[PDB]
Each structure stands twice: as C-alpha cells, then as structure tokens.
C-alpha cells in the first residue's frame, strides 16, 4: 500500500523541514515539524509536537497549509 | 500528448500541427524550439503530458533528462530533475526514467518531473536493490555469437570468412586494424545486419565519433537499433560527453542481467579528443595521462558470472602518416583478446573481404567450439599457412562459393 | 568484530548483514563503503574490533595499514597510524601489524590504532632487535628446489623437462625469455603448483603488473598462496606503488630467517611504468635514469649466510614490434644466474612445453646436484647437442613418457 | 612486575602534555596525589618512564603506575 505523493508535494514539504518551520494539521476531523525519513519502503514525517514525536504518514495526509505556503496534496 | 511521438515526427507535419493550434509562423526556428512552443501552448489538460529520457547529473547537484534521437544534445526541451528526487530514488547517471511532467510555473526555463512511473523498465522500489558494476566478477567467453546465415548469398561470404577466421562470444574485447580505403564500413554494416538477424534478444549500440553527415544518415537508415553520432563540426567535449553517456547507459543495462553489444569506430579519435580536453610528460605529441580515460572505456568489456554480458568491438586506424596514430596504436596493443587485420594489397586488386588470414585469431577458442569443429579448423589452417595473402583470399572465396552453412564445405575436403 | 573476516565475505552476505542491523540503502555502493558503514554502526561496545595490516609510511610522517585482499589499494577503511607510535615501536614500511582499533573521534576521518599485539608474527620487543637486510652477506645457492612430483601425469612432463634443463636453487635470479603466444602463462602456473605441493614451508607470492581483468580472477582461483595485481586501466603511479609494497614486505620476512619466492610476470612492463613517472637521456625512448629503480628490485635476490633466502623469477618480452622492448631486454642481459628460452617455431607445431634446450642453462650447476646426476646430465647434453630444436623436443617428449621418474629414464638410457 | 604497557590513545595525549611544560596531578596509583610538572618521557631495558621537574627535583615515574593526569585540557583517565 502507501500510495506515493507527487514530487512537487514532496519538494516544498522537504523545503519546509529546513529552518524548523511549523505546519497546520492536528485532528483528522500550530505544529512544529522536525524531519522526514523512510523505513521498509515507507516515508514518514517526524514532528516535535511539544516533545511528542508523532510519525505522520504521507499516504494518510488530509491537507497542509501555512501563512506563506498553501498546497493540497493530491 | 507524448514527447517521444513528438520528437519522432517530420518537421513538415510538425509545422502544420502547430498551425492548427493558433500558433504563428514556426517555420524559421529550430526543431526543439518548435517542440517547446507546441508543448507550452498545449498546457490546459491536467494530464496526458508524458515524457521519458536518460539521466545526466551535473556537478552542482541537479540533473537533466536527455533524448537519444538528438544524440543527447542539450537544448530547450530537456526535463529538469531536482536533487531531492535524486536523494529520494537513489538515482544515478545513465538511468532511463519515464513518467509525467509539468509546465514551468514562473521564473523557470524548463519543464519539470511530476511523477515517476518506471526506472530502467522496472518498478521504482525494485530498481534500488541491484549490485554495482565494479562489484561483479569477470569470466571468459564461454558462449558464442554465430554470424553466418543460411541463405546462399554474396553478402554471406564476408560473414562466413569472419566465422572461419575469428569466432566471437559474449563478453569479447575485439580489435580491427584497418588501413585507409580497405572496406571497413561495409564490414561494420555486415556485422550489424548479422547480429540483428541472428540474435534479436540482445541490445545493439552503434557509436560514431568524428564522421561526416552523409555517413551518419546512411548508418541511421540502415541499422536496426540505436545509432548515436557526432560530426567533425562539433568540439571535443561533445565527443567526450557522447562516449560517457553511452558507456554509462550500457553499464546500467548490464546491471539488470542483460546482454549489450557496442560497435565503436576509431577509438583513435576518441583518444585524440581526450588528449585535446585533458589538462596538461610528452611521448611524441600525446600526454601520458591523456590515455587513462579511453582505456577505462575499453576495459569495461567482460562476462559476468551472475548473468549478463558487455561486448565491445572497436576499430583502430594505421598507416595514416601521423605519429599520434602510431603512438596510440602501440599503447593499445595487447589489451584485447580478438584481432582482425585488413590489408591494402588485397583491396587494390578488388577482392571483396580483404582479410589477412594468417594474422587473425582469438584467444581461448577451445571454449567457443566443439572438438570436431576445432579439428576441422586446425586442418584448414594447416593448408593456408604456406600461401600468400591474395592467393589465400582467392582460394577461400573460390572454395566457399560452392556450398553453404560452413559444414558442406568441410565435407568437400574429405 | 574482525576486519579480515569482513573483507572475505561476498557483498551479497554483507548487504544482508547490514540490513539485519537497521541500516538504510547500501546496495548501490562499493565494498569498502559498506564495510565502513557496518563498522561504524557496530561501534557501541568498547574493546571489540580487531585488525591487521601492512604499514606504508607516507612522506608527511604518518602511516596507514593496508590489506592484501584489495592489492593494497587506498580506501576509506584503512587504519591510521600516528608518528608517535612509529617512534615508539621503531616501525618501517612493509611491517605487518595486528592489534586493536577504535572508532574515529569527531573531526577525524579514519579508524585508528588502539593496542599493538603482534609485529611480524612476533612480540613487539622481540622485533625491536633484528639486523637490517643490507647488512647481511650473499653467496651462491646450495639447497635445490625440485619440481618433479613423480605422479605419472601429463602435467609432470613440463616439470621433468624443467628439472633436466635448468635446475633452480634457493636464492636464484632467473630470467625467462618468451616470444608472443608460446604458452608462457601455462608454464608459470605449472611452477606454482610444484612449489606449493613439494615445499610447503616457503612463502609464495605472485605479482602481475599490466594483466587483463579476466586473467586475474583465473590465477586467483588456482594458486595456493598470495596473488597481487593491477589491470591496464589504471595509472602508471599505481603500477609502481604495488611493486614497492611487495619487495619491502619480502625483506622484512628474510630478517626472521625465512625463505620467500616471488614470481614476477613481465619485468618489461614494470620498466615501462618507471619511464612514465621519473623526471626527464631517452635512449630509444627510455630515459637512462628510468632503469635504476627496476634494477634495484631484481638485484635483491640472494642467499643469506646468517639464514634465510630470496628467489626471483621474472619474464622478459621479446619480438613484439616495439623498439622500447628491445632496448630494455639488452640492458638486463647478463645480470641473472639462470636462463630459460622459449621457441615460437615449436609452439606453431602444437608441441609443448617448447623449451629451446640448446640455449638454456644455469651457472654453478655442480653445487646444486650430486656427481652421478651431473655425469648423467652431461651425457644427455652431449647426446642432444647435434639435433635440431623441434627434433630434440620431440625426442625428449617421446623418451620421457616411458618411465615415472627421471632416475628410471637415466637407467633406461644405459 | 613485568611492566604491562599502556594504550596508544593515552600515550599520544600524554606526549602532548610533555610539550609546553603543562602541570597535571599524576603522582601514584595507591593514594598519593598532589601536583607535578611532566617534562619528557624515555625508555630503558623495555621499560618506559616520565621525567618531570617538580620543584626542581626530577624523579622517574613509570607509565604502568599513573592513574590520572588531571590538567585543565587533558583531565580524565583510568590508566
């Protein structure tokens, strides 16, 4: 499983990881970003939510906006 | 629609295709400019823009996708690849990549890649677990590439003589020593035709370094496979780039357990271009360090124990009245395991194959033949030894002109 | 754990070993990078990693430990040695060191030495007092190295003729003169098989200088000793570096009273590499000062009077069409005490081993053989003298295949 | 008493302590410990020593007895 995302959606996201920028996604109904790694052919998005290191999967992403960037992963 | 189909269309139809789309006079620009304009106009449908190409990585970190129909010439219709994707997919120079591209947003000059579909005609997560090329072990040619066909013809005599003189296997490193105007291009064309007919499972590559445009057109219209060439109008860096691209593509293909064959014309002029380009001791005009890169090229041929093969058949020039050619030929002597000599004397009398029989031969013939065939070949070789060049060639032609398949000719000497 | 046990396993098992440790994508890299990554990931347990190597002191003052499995090629997985340790243990290039290693500290690039356990397979304080190789005195050979095995097979018919023509002792300096295509590679492999089976107490070392890639993997799976080589697609500086490390390592073993044997492929190729690396009288292209280093390598063969030995058998190429190879062979004429010639005429009639018997011989034969044997060989030499080359070879081959040993052939000659 | 040699790691850093005439706290590896002034190190009959300049008087300290070399830069060691 784990349908891969578009290169353009993985480019800005990887560029957003630099300079410790924040994101906008908490519930599925402000958040610090840390880095993004891959394991067993599956990429993950490690975020430092006030000490909590949550592993958000890119395949299960609702949306991603910002005060300067805005983009809707397809 | 498809970039590949667009590149494979004559310019006359390409002009009328863009005239129907509201575009003005495109008849006075170059082909790639027309392609770029047509692509830029047809930028409304969110899908149906597909592209593929071979990857070249620049020293800055970003890469480009190039096309073989222009012989990997840089231009306005290349496809940009970001370093992030290179890190993502473990990409390397020489990889063939297919997928979808997108128009340049603003402040950019090139189309960019959107989604990767195939890498090296395989799934992206399957083509990142293959072992490298200096990681495999080489063996001898324990296999055989037969050249002679069955039908009785005149063009088959050359193939039959070649089969009788020097057998060829998968993984060979062969050399052809040719004086001027001795019929070498016909030899290369005959070998290419025989390979195309007999073995359709291999990948054929033809490389031309410093030719003339008419020869390029003839070779492109005659050969069933890939033909890549550069003319003498272009600088030497172009020759170097073409050679490196071809060798890297061949290596990446061999990594997948394939069989690749390369036909190289005038390794001498490749060495000359490398001498021109390489920074500056002297041994008669050439730099000592200038010959390092070409030898690496010639050193890539081997038989892989894990599966796959890379065969290289190269041409060398002699008797051109230049010290550089003699030095290059003397340095490259003894590196291969197959030799084929051509003679000017036979060519002056208008004898077709013009092959010097007593000088040719291959190492390790015992592995490419059976016992009976080796015995018959030794018996034949014993008779020709006292004869002269023209006498031996006339004898061989006269005897071979009767029966076919190189079997009935061996039963006619009982 | 162990560096030696890690460099010997194939890359396919190394990839699985790395994957069973939580490593990321290391299948598209070279062997040395995978080894370095595996070493760095296992660095989480003090005092666990072992190591060994051969020291090469650089001109800046520090040294490196290199391995024989890569033909002493510099890589990221070498072991750094500081000048303080060199001063502390009185070390020289060519020394073999085994001990402990430690991970690289932040800011450094290489693993470093932690504790010295053995130097030249001895205690560090015991290898501190050994007289230098240039302070020993040389004499003629005494003990003989017999090649005959007394089996009765076909491969023994070369060793028996070798024993009849040119006996070899401990400390010889022999030269083999060979024309192209006369079975010079099959003769060298026959000598290596006779030494490993008859004299297992000696240290065997084979060295190739400009071989083809497929000829290196074949000799590495046949010789029961240490094989080191460099291919033709490498620089001239890499040919010189491989030869300096093999002669320095042999002198270090003769100081512990041992017997070492070196089989050098072609001394003509080593002299060509020194002519391209030494600063600019080019006699026939060969600088007069570019023949001093090669004569220093060949002149180290001798029989020590305090104990130990060093025998060297090199090959000289002749009749190749090069004016440089004829100038090099004329300079190394009259420097050896043993000589074996090869005839192309005998190899054209498919007769092996083709040893010109009327031109080969050794100096001071009386010291290596008993009186009766010398008389029998004198009788044989007188008998064979008037015959021709091919005739004498056929006569010897016919006569030697009726008995099992040379003693039974001398009593049958009555 | 056969004098078991010390590691190649401590030696190198102890060879840098000899340079620039630093002040450490080596003393003995029983209970005795206070100041000194390492100046150089030499060998004799397969035995190493450390020549210092503690208040003029120069003694010979073995490397198989030192337990630590507390000095602002190079401080910690067990051997």
Author numbering:
A (entry chain c): 4 to 32, 37 to 81
B (entry chain C), C (entry chain D): 1 to 280, 284 to 417
D (entry chain d): 3 to 81
Which of the paper's sentences describe this entry?
The Rho factor is a ring-shaped ATP-dependent hexameric helicase that is conserved throughout the bacterial kingdom. Rho plays an indispensable function in transcriptional termination and gene regulation in bacteria.
The assembled complex was further validated in gel filtration assay, and the results confirmed the extensive interactions between Rof and Rho. The overall structure shows a Rho hexamer (open-ring state, comprising six protomers A-F) interacting with six Rof proteins in each of its protomers. The architecture of Rho is identical to previously reported open-ring state Rho structures, in which the midpoints of protomers A and F at either end of the ring are offset by 45 Å and leaves a 12 Å wide gap. Rof binds extensively to Rho by attaching its N-terminal α-helix to the N-terminal of Rho. The negative-charged residues Asn9, Asp11, Asp14 from Rof N-terminal α-helix form hydrogen bonds and salt bridges with Lys115, Lys105, Ser82, Gln85, Ser84 in Rho, respectively. It appears that the open-ring gap between protomer F and A is causing a disruption in the interactions between Rof’s β3-β4 loops and Rho. As a result, the density of Rof in protomer F is considerably worse and has lower local resolution compared to the other protomers of Rho.
